[PDB]
Every structure is written in C-alpha cells, then in structure tokens.
C-alpha cells in the first residue's frame, strides 16, 4: 500500500464563549474524519459511512463512555496547567495520538500535548520518555515518568494496537482510502509585467492528496524561485495544486502521483 495513518485529537477550552464546546475530539484515517465527540452531544458518532456500516452500536456506546471520562480528565488537567502558569481567562489544551503504516512496512507512533496552541509535551516511545518545553511541562513530565507501567502501556498501544486498528479501518474504507484518481494537469503561459512570462503548472481532480510537482530547465533542476500552491480540497473528495516559475531555455513541469510520472513540456 501507500502511507496511511490513524490519529485522534482532543481540544479542551476553559471558560469557552457561547458556541464553543468545552471539549471536542475527532479521529482521522489519512485526511478523512472518521469519528467525532464533543461536550455538547456527549455522544461519539461516525463521520464516515464506512465506519458506521462496519461498527456495531455497542462500539459507539463503549467509546461514548470512555470519551466522557477523557473529557473530565482533560478538564482537570487544563485547570492544573493554568494553576502552574498562574493563568486566568480562556486557554486551550490539545492532544494528538496516532500511528503511521509506511509503504515499506515500517511504522511510526506519536503522542504529543500542546497548551495555547504551542508544543508542550512530546512522547518518545523509543526511549519511553517525555520531552518538556519548559519548567511547567517538566513538572508534568516527572509525574508521568514515575509510572513505568503506563509508559510501557503507551509504547505498546502506539506500536501494536494503533496499527491494528488502522489496518482494520483501512479495510472498512478500502473503496475510498485505497482508490486512485490520477491528476488532470495543464500548463499555462502568460506575459505578466512587461518582459516577464509566468508558467503555471496546475493539477486537479486527484486522490490521494499526496502529489509531487516541480519545474525543470533543459532536463535539470531549476535554481530559480518556484512558487507552490497548497494542496487544497476541491469539495468532491479530490484535490488540486499548482507550481509556478518565471520564464527567463526549455522548461518542463514534472508531476508524480501514486507511482505514475508525468512530464509536460512547454512549447
């Protein structure tokens, strides 16, 4: 296969204004949301039809209960952080856990926390330790590192459980997640400012979103400034992107997607 990933986020907000839930948690497989939970619904729900059609109601019921516990834990942890910092008003606490199954068969796993949108604690499952960004995070690191068994549980979850869940969901959604829609690619030239020609290489309609685009001169790599467009969702499940250069003698746009290479030579 290609590279795939499973990850869960949590977002906690203290004293939220009207309309902002106190706690939100969303799961993703690759770029697709698969589950959602928040402090208003207090229910875990599928965000993809291939999750709903493949997971019994007992499943949603069980993780609804767990998420209610994780919400409460997040609330208290955020309160203790604000006390550590002597902070009042509204602040945010976030978590991201997950794993990746690489094309070559290797795996990665990660677990990280942030406070007010900035890195706070980063777990290293290969050494079983937490990296702290400041003295407050260091205080939390010492508490978490004193529970040797919990560090072993986390490593096991990232390396074995998370990957198995990911392969399970990959099969559930295989018709979406493992498909290939090749890009439609075009090159446009235009004189812009007097004497300045712009070449745009534009791709759309492609899935998965991972795509490589570059410009080359006479068959060798450019040394001039290349502008890259973001890889953007088009709304229909496919994506679009572009790269552009300023023409100065033989330019070509090079695109790679899902193991197919394409070359577009400029006339």
């Amino acid at each position, epitope marked *: 296969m290609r590279t795939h990933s499973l990850r869960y986020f949590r977002l906690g907000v203290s004293d939220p204004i009207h309309g902002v839930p106190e706690f939100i948690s969303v799961g993703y497989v690759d770029s697709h949301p698969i589950t959602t939970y928040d402090s208003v619904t207090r229910q875990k729900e599928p965000r993809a039809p291939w999750m709903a059609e493949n997971l019994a109601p007992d*499943h949603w*019921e*069980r*993780y609804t*209960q*767990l998420l*209610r*516990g*994780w*919400q*409460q*834990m997040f609330k208290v942890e955020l309160k203790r952080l604000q006390r550590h910092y002597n902070h009042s008003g509204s602040h945010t606490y976030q978590r991201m856990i997950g794993c990746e199954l690489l094309e070559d068969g290797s795996t990665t796993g990660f677990l990280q926390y942030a406070y007010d949108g900035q890195d706070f604690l980063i777990f290293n499952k290969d050494t079983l330790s937490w990296l702290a960004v400041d003295n407050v995070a260091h205080t939390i690191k010492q508490a978490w590192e004193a*529970n040797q*068994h*919990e560090l*072993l*549980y*986390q*490593k*096991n*979850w990232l390396e*074995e*459980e998370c990957i*198995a*869940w990911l392969k399970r969901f990959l099969e559930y959604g295989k018709d979406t997640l493992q498909r290939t829609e090749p890009p439609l690619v075009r090159v446009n030239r235009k004189e812009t400012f007097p004497g300045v020609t712009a070449l745009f290489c534009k791709a759309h309609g492609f899935y998965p979103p991972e795509i490589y685009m570059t410009w080359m001169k006479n068959g060798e790599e450019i040394v001039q400034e290349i502008d890259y467009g973001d890889i953007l969702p088009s709304g229909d499940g496919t994506y679009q992107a572009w790269a552009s250069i300023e023409l100065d003698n033989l330019y070509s746009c090079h695109v790679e997607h899902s193991g197919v290479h394409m070359v577009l030579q400029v006339p």
Partner: antibody
Amino acid sequence: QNIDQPTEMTATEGAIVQINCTYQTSGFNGLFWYQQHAGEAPTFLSYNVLDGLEEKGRFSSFLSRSKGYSYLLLKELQMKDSASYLCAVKDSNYQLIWGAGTKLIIKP
Amino acid sequence: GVTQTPKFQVLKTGQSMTLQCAQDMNHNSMYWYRQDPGMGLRLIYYSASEGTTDKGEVPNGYNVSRLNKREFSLRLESAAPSQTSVYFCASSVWTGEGSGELFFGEGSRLTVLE
C-alpha cells in the same frame, strides 16, 4: 474472547510454583494478576504489557505477547501463599476479561 | 480505600436492596462485580466518570447510581435467588489508561431465599 488458567494447583512448602494464564483476545492492553485469599477481596499483584519478567519479592510475572501467555511464579512457597490467583486481560476496548482463577494449595 | 456495605445480607425473593460503595482516593471510575463459583468476575454496571454510567456484562435485575465522584450504589430491584452471590465494588484512577489497577471493596455476601 477467552482466558484460561488452571482450576487448582498444589505445591509443597519451600518449593516453587508457576501459574499459567493463556488468553485469546481481539487486541491486548495489558495482563493483571490479583491475589484473593479466601473470603477476602482481590488485591493487585502485577501488570505486564511488554515481553519479559518483572520480579516483586518472591513473586514474578512473565508475559509473552506472541504466544499469548503469562505466568505467575512464586518461589520459596509459604503456607500463607494459599489463596486464589486471578488473571485478567484488558482487551482492545480496554475492557477486562477475567480468568476463573487458580486455587493454590500448599502442602506443609 | 474502598468502603462497601453491608458485609452480609439475607433477602426474601421480591425484596429490594441497595449496596453502598464509597472511595476516598479521588478515583474517577467505579465498578460493581459479582463473584460466583467456577467463573471469572462478571461486571454488572460501571461508571467511567462522575456523571455517566453504563451496563456491563450482566445488567439485568440491577441498576446503579453514581451519586457523586465518591459513591456508586448498586440497587437490586426485585431480588431473585439467581442474585445470590458475592458482590464487589471496585475503583480505579481512570478507565481506559491500560495499566491502572483496580482497588476492591471488602465484598458483600447476599443470599436471596423464597
């Protein structure tokens, strides 16, 4: 899902006993041992989630994830070790599955 | 750290009954188990956090109330002789953390007779 430990074991005082526990679960998040004397509450003995052997006094707990197997090892057995020993696995959904317990009898 | 009452109770069929359990360890999760010969502990109901509860494996004939963070009552609606057992309340710091162990109450012996 299932978890199996012998109903009853008997060993001689001063010797060694190894209580096995095998488990077939969809997913794995740790294995616990509890000691329960007759008429009392279970109390936590050990936890293993990665491969190896952890020692706590005369008691040691072993896990092999690939063979789906743990044992509880008591050495230098004393009469007061007579009790039931309960094995429990936490599954992929963090639910506990309990073995029916091993009654351990110590012959003086 | 888990206080459970009563230690023993005789009940007639159809009678109601509430078991008390409180923990002072600031634990968030509480559990009610029954222990019967020849089988592993069976969860009746649990409470992952203050403010929520859900059924376990054998919920029929029982209900629970998580009165607050400390206390988790078990109610026998109309006692049946099949409910003769030993009941254990338990708690743990959170649930779904993997390595956290259970702390058990002392047990409650219930016998239901016609």
